[PDB]
């Protein structure tokens with residue numbers, strides 16, 4: 001019989017960003033494994049308590065492998081996994097494991113560091129902007145990596161952050177982008193899921209980056225590049241392991257070296273000196289010659305976090321709740 005695989009999304013496949021990319025991973029798994037797998041998905045599932053009913057129903061319907069693709073499914077996934085010990089659960093970006101519960105994530109911050117390098121080359125104000133969802137480790141690593149990448153070019157760069165308290169709401173994302181631009185940011189990145197920030201950047205004559213997918217068709221003048229998320233090989237490997245009986249609970253983190261994180265082509269507006277530097281830093285990121293959180297690092301209180309010649313430990317990366325010097329908030333509107 002085919003292995004029944006289900007995907008739980010916190011957003012819509014029509015976001016053209018994060019959920020789109022997870023769903024392209026599901027479709028890659030279907031193409032790679034053919035008749036050996038039967039996939040289904042549910043979109044726009046609310047995070048926290050109400051997700052538990054959806055996850056339980058997919059397990060009750062006979063799914064043997066369930067991917068919960070958002071941070072806020074962590075505790076519902078852990079509870080359903082205890083109730084379904086013969087089902088394999090994989091939770092994106094979480095830190096809770098069990099005999100039948102693994103966690104997976106990308107090192108997207110490797111891409112965000114490269115975006116910061118390019119932002120420092122393209123900014124006219126010296127202020128880069130970040131549209132944030134919630135202050136969880138995934139997002140704080142991306143804010144810090146954007147800032148460190150920019151500071152590798154111009155140590156005087158400032159990063160302004162605005163929080164929308166949602167992963168996906170194109171109206172709120174549009175308003176947040178307008179506010180960052182009004183407060184002097186002219187190269188924007190995000191950890192929300194829509195092309196709204198890009199559309200605002202194009203309207204105002206500013207720059208921004210795609211997130212999880214190439215978003216250039218939404219804003220071809222503003223789109224400098226994008227950090228593309230490729231989940232298809234991970235979803236394939238995981239479904240293969242369950243079918244073959246090799247699956248075990250583990251924490252998986254893949255980056256540019258493993259092909260989970262890739263960069264879109266550069267916009268034609270990027271000048272040759274910036275393009276050359278970007279390609280050198282990209283090669284170094286893939287080879288591990290540079291790491292985004294290599295020392296020396298200080299936090300925003302001036303405390304040393306990592307000495308020169310050391311790297312930030314995996315446990316500090318996993319729990320990151322501190323900001324590098326140069327990160328600030330927006331004035332509340």
Ligand SMILES: CCNc1nc(O)nc(NC(C)C)n1
Nearest residue numbers: 010011018070071167191192
């Ligand atoms: C709709 C839920 N979206 C979501 N959830 C988690 O956990 N992380 C991300 N990250 C993107 C790169 C911003 N997005």
